[PDB]
DNA sequence: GAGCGTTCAGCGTTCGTTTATCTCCCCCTGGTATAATGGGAGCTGTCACGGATGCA
């Protein structure tokens, strides 16, 4: 349990647990530029909380493709 | 010589020794007889550089 001043007294020593900043799960769209192509490239990636991740990259060489856990 | 005075003596006399017997638990091995028949699982995002290595 946590006392009234927000510290966990474990084994006679006062600990504190600090908050932690993490990337929230969801879809994120990133735009980039390929120097060889001379044109913008767009990607999508859905990063879940627990499962394997999935990506959807468009116009790498003018076609759209999917990475199922980046297997192939 | 009397009476006792020092000091080897070798000899017993069992007590001294170290050395020989003899009784016991951890430790290792083997065996169970309905039927049972291909894993969970943890990831992921730096950055540049280069050279090997694949493939249109």
Short mmCIF file of C-alpha atoms (C1' of nucleotides) in Angstrom, two decimals:
data_model
loop_
_atom_site.label_atom_id
_atom_site.label_comp_id
_atom_site.label_asym_id
_atom_site.label_seq_id
_atom_site.Cartn_x
_atom_site.Cartn_y
_atom_site.Cartn_z
CA UNK A 1 0.00 0.00 0.00
CA UNK A 2 0.91 3.65 -0.46
CA UNK A 3 0.92 6.01 2.52
CA UNK A 4 -0.80 9.40 2.63
CA UNK A 5 2.26 11.22 1.24
CA UNK A 6 2.59 8.94 -1.80
CA UNK A 7 5.54 6.69 -1.00
CA UNK A 8 5.70 2.89 -0.79
CA UNK A 9 7.52 1.87 2.38
CA UNK A 10 8.91 -1.52 1.30
CA UNK A 11 11.48 -3.38 3.46
CA UNK A 12 11.95 -0.36 5.72
CA UNK A 13 13.08 1.92 2.85
CA UNK A 14 10.89 4.59 1.26
CA UNK A 15 10.43 4.01 -2.47
CA UNK A 16 8.66 6.22 -4.99
CA UNK A 17 7.33 5.11 -8.36
CA UNK A 18 7.75 7.74 -11.04
CA UNK A 19 5.50 8.24 -14.05
CA UNK A 20 6.63 7.07 -17.47
CA UNK A 21 6.15 8.61 -20.91
CA UNK A 22 5.42 6.11 -23.70
CA UNK A 23 4.12 6.27 -27.26
CA UNK A 24 0.38 5.67 -27.13
CA UNK A 25 -0.96 2.79 -29.26
CA UNK A 26 -2.72 3.65 -32.49
CA UNK A 27 -2.07 4.49 -36.11
CA UNK A 28 0.67 6.96 -37.07
CA UNK A 29 1.21 8.34 -40.58
CA UNK A 30 4.68 9.59 -41.50
CA UNK A 31 5.66 11.47 -44.66
CA UNK A 32 9.24 11.34 -45.91
CA UNK A 33 11.22 12.10 -49.06
CA UNK A 34 13.34 9.65 -51.05
CA UNK A 35 16.42 11.26 -52.61
CA UNK A 36 16.60 8.77 -55.50
CA UNK A 37 12.86 9.01 -56.25
CA UNK A 38 12.88 12.86 -55.89
CA UNK A 39 9.31 12.55 -54.57
CA UNK A 40 7.52 12.19 -51.24
CA UNK A 41 6.87 8.76 -49.73
CA UNK A 42 4.13 8.02 -47.21
CA UNK A 43 3.95 5.23 -44.66
CA UNK A 44 1.50 3.96 -42.08
CA UNK A 45 2.14 1.85 -39.02
CA UNK A 46 -0.31 0.53 -36.44
CA UNK A 47 1.55 -0.26 -33.23
CA UNK A 48 -0.62 -2.23 -30.78
CA UNK A 49 -0.36 -2.68 -27.04
CA UNK A 50 0.43 -6.40 -27.14
CA UNK A 51 0.28 -7.98 -30.59
CA UNK A 52 2.60 -8.02 -33.55
CA UNK A 53 2.79 -4.86 -35.58
CA UNK A 54 1.71 -4.00 -39.08
CA UNK A 55 2.89 -1.47 -41.63
CA UNK A 56 1.55 -0.15 -44.92
CA UNK A 57 4.07 1.61 -47.15
CA UNK A 58 2.92 3.34 -50.34
CA UNK A 59 4.92 4.18 -53.52
CA UNK A 60 8.29 2.78 -52.49
CA UNK A 61 8.72 2.21 -56.25
CA UNK A 62 5.18 3.48 -57.17
CA UNK A 63 3.31 0.52 -55.61
CA UNK A 64 1.69 0.14 -52.19
CA UNK A 65 2.72 -2.71 -49.88
CA UNK A 66 2.28 -4.23 -46.43
CA UNK A 67 4.73 -5.45 -43.79
CA UNK A 68 3.17 -8.24 -41.70
CA UNK A 69 5.64 -8.02 -38.75
CA UNK A 70 8.32 -7.14 -41.37
CA UNK A 71 8.61 -10.78 -42.41
CA UNK A 72 8.74 -9.93 -46.10
"C1'" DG B 1 81.79 -53.60 60.69
"C1'" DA B 2 77.38 -50.50 62.09
"C1'" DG B 3 73.84 -48.11 59.94
"C1'" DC B 4 72.76 -45.90 56.28
"C1'" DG B 5 74.29 -43.40 51.67
"C1'" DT B 6 74.20 -42.86 46.37
"C1'" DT B 7 73.59 -44.71 42.45
"C1'" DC B 8 73.65 -47.78 38.55
"C1'" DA B 9 71.03 -52.66 36.93
"C1'" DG B 10 68.23 -55.07 34.78
"C1'" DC B 11 63.58 -56.55 35.56
"C1'" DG B 12 59.06 -56.70 36.04
"C1'" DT B 13 54.32 -54.77 35.75
"C1'" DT B 14 51.20 -53.22 33.91
"C1'" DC B 15 50.20 -48.78 31.76
"C1'" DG B 16 51.94 -46.42 27.74
"C1'" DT B 17 51.69 -45.76 22.59
"C1'" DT B 18 49.88 -46.17 17.61
"C1'" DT B 19 48.25 -49.64 15.02
"C1'" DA B 20 45.23 -53.06 13.73
"C1'" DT B 21 40.08 -54.82 13.64
"C1'" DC B 22 35.00 -54.22 13.28
"C1'" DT B 23 29.56 -51.75 12.71
"C1'" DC B 24 26.49 -47.81 9.83
"C1'" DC B 25 23.58 -43.24 6.50
"C1'" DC B 26 24.29 -40.38 2.69
"C1'" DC B 27 24.57 -41.19 -2.10
"C1'" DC B 28 23.46 -43.41 -6.63
"C1'" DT B 29 20.50 -46.33 -9.40
"C1'" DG B 30 16.13 -48.50 -11.12
"C1'" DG B 31 11.30 -48.69 -11.52
"C1'" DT B 32 6.23 -47.55 -11.70
"C1'" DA B 33 1.46 -50.21 -17.18
"C1'" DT B 34 -6.20 -46.64 -18.46
"C1'" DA B 35 -4.75 -42.91 -22.00
"C1'" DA B 36 -1.95 -39.01 -22.79
"C1'" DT B 37 1.43 -37.84 -29.41
"C1'" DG B 38 4.84 -31.02 -33.01
"C1'" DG B 39 6.55 -24.50 -27.69
"C1'" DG B 40 5.03 -20.32 -26.41
"C1'" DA B 41 6.60 -15.49 -26.99
"C1'" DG B 42 8.63 -11.34 -27.39
"C1'" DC B 43 9.50 -8.23 -29.84
"C1'" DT B 44 9.55 -2.92 -32.66
"C1'" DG B 45 11.51 2.15 -33.32
"C1'" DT B 46 19.72 5.58 -32.65
"C1'" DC B 47 22.88 7.03 -36.55
"C1'" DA B 48 26.12 6.80 -40.28
"C1'" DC B 49 29.24 4.06 -42.93
"C1'" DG B 50 30.65 0.51 -45.74
"C1'" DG B 51 30.99 -3.75 -48.12
"C1'" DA B 52 29.11 -8.04 -48.79
"C1'" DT B 53 25.17 -10.25 -51.04
"C1'" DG B 54 21.20 -10.71 -53.37
"C1'" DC B 55 18.41 -10.11 -57.69
"C1'" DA B 56 15.99 -7.49 -61.47
#
